Design a protein around this nucleic acid. Structure first.
Ligand SMILES: [Mg+2]
Ligand SMILES: [Mg+2]
Ligand SMILES: [Mg+2]
Ligand SMILES: [Mg+2]
Ligand SMILES: [Mg+2]
Ligand SMILES: [Mg+2]
Ligand SMILES: [Mg+2]
Ligand SMILES: [Mg+2]
Ligand SMILES: [Mg+2]
Ligand SMILES: [Mg+2]
Ligand SMILES: [Mg+2]
Ligand SMILES: [Mg+2]
Ligand SMILES: [Mg+2]
Ligand SMILES: [Mg+2]
Ligand SMILES: [Mg+2]
Ligand SMILES: [Mg+2]
Ligand SMILES: [Mg+2]
Ligand SMILES: [Mg+2]
Ligand SMILES: [Mg+2]
Ligand SMILES: [Mg+2]
Ligand SMILES: [Mg+2]
Ligand SMILES: [Mg+2]
Ligand SMILES: [Mg+2]
Ligand SMILES: [Mg+2]
Lengths: 99, 99, 94, 217, 203
RNA sequence: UUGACCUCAAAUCAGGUAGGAGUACCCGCUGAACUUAAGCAUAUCAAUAAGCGGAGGAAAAGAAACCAACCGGGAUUGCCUUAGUAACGGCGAGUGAAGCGGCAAAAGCUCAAAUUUGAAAUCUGGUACCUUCGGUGCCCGAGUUGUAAUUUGGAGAGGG
RNA sequence: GGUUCUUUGUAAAGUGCCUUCGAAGAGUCGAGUUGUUUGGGAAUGCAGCUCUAAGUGGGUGGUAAAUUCCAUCUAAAGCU
RNA sequence: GAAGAGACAUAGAGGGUGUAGAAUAAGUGGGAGCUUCGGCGCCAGUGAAAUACCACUACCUUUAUAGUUUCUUUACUUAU
């Protein structure tokens, strides 16, 4: 979730949704990098597992799909940002109450 | 086509046995591949539309092709690009309307 | 360069086989005998202007009037565009 | 260029003629209507015309057509299934404009002869042009039946102040192949002559006499 | 690969996503120094296709240049000559802002060689460029025959002599009838066309 | 508490590199006026002098987003020529190319865009030993935000 | 010349046919405008500002423009 | 961002001058019934017009929705 420039991955959720590939936006390119012996990986993927992990992969894919791909159509419609700072937010909610 | 054997006229020139050389791989520099079509379609739906493209779609919906093409010629530099851009916006309009 | 002229293509291919016949390629690890260096390949294989016709043959006069032919070729080319336009409008009328 | 898709309008007809015949029957003859709505057009200033377009087949076999001429045209009318009046009766009848309207409305359209080209519009014409059917001379040697059967399928494109010019192409009783070719040629020719061509027309209308309000475009 | 998506995405500069990134980045660059080292290319696909390599000895700098015309730098606008040369304000530098950017980056890092450069951003006051540089002293470049051409001394300060892509564009180096004045170098053409050629046996 | 990552720093840190000179020729930028027009402002002088920056033994250009309109040529450069011609110009004064053709010399090519994915196969550096313009092993690092191999449109790739 | 290293290689290159493909450079092309420059003349190149593409697409074809073809190359990356 | 008002498109909404036919008649030709009605138009009178049916609405805003954005001041804060 913290790649710079973000252009490198910003199309990945769309591509995964288009291609039917389950994806999760996850905290840490450093965390991804430590599981591939790098400082930073920016992406990780499983193309196949062993039988002893197929059920764990299936259940985790189901939870990850419920969190990312199944929300993709709604998340695509909503703008982030527009959040105020501490002082501006205070001075906004006092005028919401006052008038 | 075929030379007429004389020095003036429509197909003037010397009659010679022709050979039709094998096509160069250049002369296909401007060809859409399956990779390019996929990538451009994904980027279209990710990035959405430009402000002038949105104005063009509104113009097509409201005043029609002639006024849309005039503004498109202004925004782009030429009539041939204005036309191509306007039938493009027609395609987005048609796809959004149908189904 | 592209080949669209069979005569020129045949001439160059004959040129290539003829050159192959008259060179010796020494092996990359053979004895490499001396072969009397000839300085000019161009002088060995000169460019020949082909024969346009025979020196003499029979007069064949069909009454074509070559000058009339040139005039009519100019006229047909000069009036193709307008005559096609009048043909197209005449076809489209009723 | 034919923007109208015959592939879709043919199945629109196949899903509408059944409506007008089988699932919703009516012994009264059903008449198929064709209306064309304009876009960004001003008939007040632009050229105005009374277009005529012959269709392959007769729309309604029960229409009334009246001929003006001498006794010869009067008797031949009975050999063509049409009515005909004399000349001196309408010469002595021209005074009242309301009666001329009353005899106008009984007939869908009128035609005349060449002996009466210069005279019929002088008396009959004033109150007859209000219906909108200009009479046409028909000669004695010319086949009366052939002329009437030519004008039976004529399509009157009388351009007026209203942009919804309703003209009936035909009926559902006849075959559908000719009806489809009819609507295709009528719209194509009108759009062809239009100054701005396809961009001029805004709406297309194909209607059943009792069918609901369906919009093709 | 991803570079094809990046290349297509970068062409949509006025989409919402690139407009947001543009505003955030142009603020960031303005806060930093006029010339500063970049830790990495912000356009990896663009850097690659200009010849950047992710290896030791390739360097990226970021530079901003003031936009606009070149005001003739005379005192009080007083040009001392005929009225055809009285212009001061609507005058244009014959090299691009990208060339000025490479020239200043090359002066700052005179131990490196400018390979190419690319646009990253602009506002009304500045244009922002990233410049690709190669270290000719670095062994990863001195070996590796695909890049040790830049080690030869004839490639010292290419950007000063107009030998980069923006340099040759500004110089007019192109084939065809449109570049008759500037095909082999316009000053060299001018000399050749203004040379009087006299032979021993005069023609 | 701790260990990363990113970004940004410091060190008389290890190793390097730039500067300045010369500048006839070369690549650019900037840029006049005297002069001519029998005056003069456009024009001319001149895309010159002066000024600034950057090279080498040559430089630059260079393997066509070329020329052409032919029965087609075929990177670049230079010479003869085209030609004081097409064209530009208070159409005044003046200015002014290019294609073809004959010659000199000739030489071709490289990346980006592609999954190695049954294995980052890639590289700087430190160190040790050597056959020291370098090699080998060991280690640290760079690098997957992509280093090697494979392809460059003339193609070429995968599979058979 | 000549002397050795002589699995010094299943290592590299090339070659035919079939099938499926064939990724080819964006504030760039291009356009408007301003200035400069050119023999380049409704605009030769260059540069600033505004607009800003496509993918049988794009450039050019020395008179501006629309419609229809055709020809010819393959830019916006690089070495010699 | 806003009081929000336009304006645009994306659905529905209704009504409407004189005359008198058989009725406040704004536009077409159609020629006589689907219908709880034998009401309504029809072969009948008549008025500029036939009148059930509008096919679109010739014309709208009187109002509701998300697509737009001309604004017109106004507020915001992160660019400056
Ligand atoms: Mg002057
Ligand atoms: Mg000035
Ligand atoms: Mg060189
Ligand atoms: Mg010149
Ligand atoms: Mg001599
Ligand atoms: Mg120079
Ligand atoms: Mg003088
Ligand atoms: Mg004098
Ligand atoms: Mg004087
Ligand atoms: Mg000059
Ligand atoms: Mg000087
Ligand atoms: Mg030296
Ligand atoms: Mg030499
Ligand atoms: Mg070079
Ligand atoms: Mg090439
Ligand atoms: Mg050549
Ligand atoms: Mg001559
Ligand atoms: Mg000029
Ligand atoms: Mg000059
Ligand atoms: Mg190979
Ligand atoms: Mg290219
Ligand atoms: Mg200048
Ligand atoms: Mg000039
Ligand atoms: Mg050719």
């Amino acid at each position: 979730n913290d790649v710079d420039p973000i252009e490198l991955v910003v199309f990945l959720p769309a591509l995964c949704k288009k291609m039917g590939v389950p994806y999760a936006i996850v905290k840490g390119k450093a965390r991804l990098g430590t599981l591939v012996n790098q400082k930073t990986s920016a992406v990780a993927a499983l193309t196949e597992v062993r039988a002893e992990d197929e059920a764990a992969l299936a259940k985790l894919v189901s939870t990850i799909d419920a969190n990312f791909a199944d929300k993709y159509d709604e998340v695509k419609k909503h703008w982030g940002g527009g959040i105020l700072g501490n002082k501006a937010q205070a001075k906004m909610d006092k005028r919401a109450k006052n008038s | 086509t075929v030379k007429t054997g004389i020095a003036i006229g429509l197909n003037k020139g010397k009659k010679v046995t022709s050979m039709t050389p094998a096509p160069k791989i250049s002369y296909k520099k401007g060809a859409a591949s399956n990779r390019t079509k996929f990538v451009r379609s994904l980027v279209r739906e990710i990035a959405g539309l430009s402000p002038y493209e949105r104005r063009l779609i509104d113009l097509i919906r409201n005043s029609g092709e002639k006024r849309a093409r005039k503004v498109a010629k202004k925004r782009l530099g030429s009539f041939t690009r204005a036309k191509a851009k306007v039938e493009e916006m027609n395609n987005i309009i048609a796809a959004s309307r149908r189904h | 360069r592209q080949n669209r002229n069979q005569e020129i293509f045949d001439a160059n291919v004959q040129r290539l086989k003829e050159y192959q016949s008259k060179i010796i390629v020494f092996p990359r690890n053979g004895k490499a005998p001396e072969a009397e260096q000839v300085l000019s390949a161009a002088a060995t294989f000169p460019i020949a202007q082909p024969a346009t016709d025979v020196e003499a043959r029979a007069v064949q006069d069909n009454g074509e009037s070559a000058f009339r032919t040139l005039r009519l070729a100019r006229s047909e080319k000069k009036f193709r565009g307008i005559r096609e336009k009048r043909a197209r409008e005449k076809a489209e009328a009723e | 260029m034919s923007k109208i898709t015959s592939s879709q309008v043919r199945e629109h007809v196949k899903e509408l003629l059944k409506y007008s015949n089988e699932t919703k029957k009516r012994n009264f003859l059903e008449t198929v209507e064709l209306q064309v709505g304009l876009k960004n057009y001003d008939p007040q200033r632009d050229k105005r015309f009374s277009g005529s377009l012959k269709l392959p087949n007769c729309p309604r076999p029960n229409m009334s057509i009246c001929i003006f001429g001498d006794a010869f045209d009067v008797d031949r009318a009975k050999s063509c299934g049409v009515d005909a009046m004399s000349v001196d009766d309408l010469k002595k009848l021209n005074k009242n404009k309301k009666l001329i309207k009353k005899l106008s409305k009984k007939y869908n359209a009128f035609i005349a002869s060449e002996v009466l080209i210069k005279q019929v519009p002088r008396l009959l014409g004033p109150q007859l042009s209000k219906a909108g059917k200009f009479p046409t001379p028909v000669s004695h040697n010319d086949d009366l039946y052939g002329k009437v059967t030519d004008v039976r399928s004529t399509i009157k494109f009388q351009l007026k102040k209203v942009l919804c010019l309703a003209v009936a192409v035909g009926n559902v009783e006849m075959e559908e192949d000719v009806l489809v070719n009819q609507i295709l040629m009528s719209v194509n020719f009108f759009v062809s002559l239009l100054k701005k061509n396809w961009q001029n027309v805004g709406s297309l209308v194909v209607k059943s006499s009792m069918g609901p309000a369906f919009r093709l475009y | 690969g991803a570079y094809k998506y990046l290349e297509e995405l970068q062409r949509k500069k006025q989409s919402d996503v690139l407009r947001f990134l543009q505003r955030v980045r142009v603020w960031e660059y303005r806060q930093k120094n006029v010339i500063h080292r970049a830790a990495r290319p912000t356009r990896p696909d663009k850097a690659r296709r200009l010849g950047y390599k992710a290896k030791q000895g390739f360097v990226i700098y970021r530079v901003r240049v003031r936009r606009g015309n070149r005001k003739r730098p005379v005192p009080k606008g007083a040009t001392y000559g005929k009225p055809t040369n009285q212009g001061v304000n609507e005058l244009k530098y014959q090299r691009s802002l990208r060339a000025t950017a490479e020239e200043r980056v090359g002066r700052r890092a005179a131990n490196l060689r400018v390979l190419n450069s690319y646009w990253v951003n602009q506002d009304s006051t500045y244009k922002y460029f990233e410049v690709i540089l190669v270290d000719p002293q670095h062994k990863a470049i001195r070996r590796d025959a695909r890049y040790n051409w830049i080690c030869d001394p004839v490639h010292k300060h290419r950007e000063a002599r107009g030998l980069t892509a923006t340099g040759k564009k500004s110089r007019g180096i192109n084939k065809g009838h449109k570049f008759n004045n500037t095909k082999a170098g316009r000053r060299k053409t001018w000399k050749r066309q203004n040379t009087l050629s006299l032979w021993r046996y005069r023609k």
